[PDB]
């Protein structure tokens, strides 16, 4: 059930994890019950520049939180998605406008209208935290 929906290899995964530091995190939040919370904590803790995106917050984990991706001042490379499958696919389009190189769908977030829209490189049904732990972790 944790089966990769993309067909990249982990040389491919090591690459994005390794060359890209600029991460937009969509669906970010202060709730602990949200998986987005722990993952953001973990990214921030391992050298990534993480900008949270959630219009229901001005701020998250001590970082200015933005209404939209278009809203972020500096460059972004990777868009990390924590929203509903009925919803996530819409961020492909925004990432492309932003000039991003990757869109990452965390678990239960992907819906195939996203292939029809896609740079870019798509990651689907994987965790940025778990892949990091496995590939680069001590």
């Amino acid at each position: 059930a944790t089966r990769p929906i993309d067909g990249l290899t982990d040389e491919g995964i090591r690459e994005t994890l390794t060359r890209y530091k600029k991460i937009a995190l969509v669906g970010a939040s202060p709730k602990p019950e949200r998986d987005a919370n722990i993952v953001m904590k973990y990214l921030l803790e391992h050298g990534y520049d993480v900008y949270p995106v959630n219009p229901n917050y001005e701020e998250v984990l001590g970082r200015k939180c933005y209404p939209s991706v278009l809203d972020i001042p500096d460059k972004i490379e990777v868009v990390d998605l924590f929203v509903n499958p009925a919803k996530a696919w819409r961020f492909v389009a925004y990432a492309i406008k932003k000039g991003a190189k990757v869109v990452w769908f965390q678990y239960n977030t992907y819906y195939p209208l996203a292939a029809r829209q896609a740079g870019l490189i798509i990651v689907a049904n994987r965790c940025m935290m778990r892949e990091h732990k496995r590939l680069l972790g001590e």
């Binding site: 509903n84 499958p85 009925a86 919803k87 819906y111 195939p112 209208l113 029809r116």
Partner: protein, 157 residues
């Protein structure tokens, strides 16, 4: 303020809060509210696999065949995300087994795409068009074969 109540209904449904959905409903919120893109509480409850909440939305008259601006319906979402019980119910309450989204996909194309056997079975049972074609002229048959699961293609002939 119905807007606030509608946004509250949407989240509770998506989150599977039985109790809460009861408070908003018995307190006036529209079971047929929508967000900016035409999503309804049923879409979100079917996406996330919240069965009992799917039942209570339908009993109180939620449109079973509501579509967003990309032409997506609750039956699309329940079939791509593998929620069978919810498929069974949706069809019982009249879901259009052959609705097309923006990409031109039906719920059959979609069950094939993430490879649900039991959900392919129920759809063919309820009259699914095994020769429906998407924007690229492909069928649910072509698809599972691309993906290498002959048995499905076998059942989807």
């Amino acid at each position: 303020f119905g807007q606030d109540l509608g946004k509250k209904l949407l989240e509770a449904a998506a989150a599977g809060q039985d109790d809460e959905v009861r408070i908003l409903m018995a307190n006036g919120a529209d079971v047929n509210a929508t967000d900016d893109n035409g999503l309804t509480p049923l879409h979100l409850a079917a996406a996330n696999g919240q069965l009992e909440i799917v039942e209570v939305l339908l009993k109180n008259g939620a449109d079973v065949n509501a579509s967003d601006s990309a032409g997506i319906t609750p039956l699309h979402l329940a079939a791509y995300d593998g929620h069978l019980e919810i498929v069974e119910v949706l069809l019982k309450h009249g879901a259009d087994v052959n609705a097309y989204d923006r990409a031109g996909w039906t719920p059959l194309h979609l069950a094939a795409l993430s490879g649900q056997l039991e959900i392919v079975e129920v759809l063919l049972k309820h009259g699914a068009d095994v020769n429906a074609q998407d924007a690229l002229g492909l069928t649910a048959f072509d698809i599972s074969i691309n993906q290498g699961q002959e048995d499905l293609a076998e059942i989807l002939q």
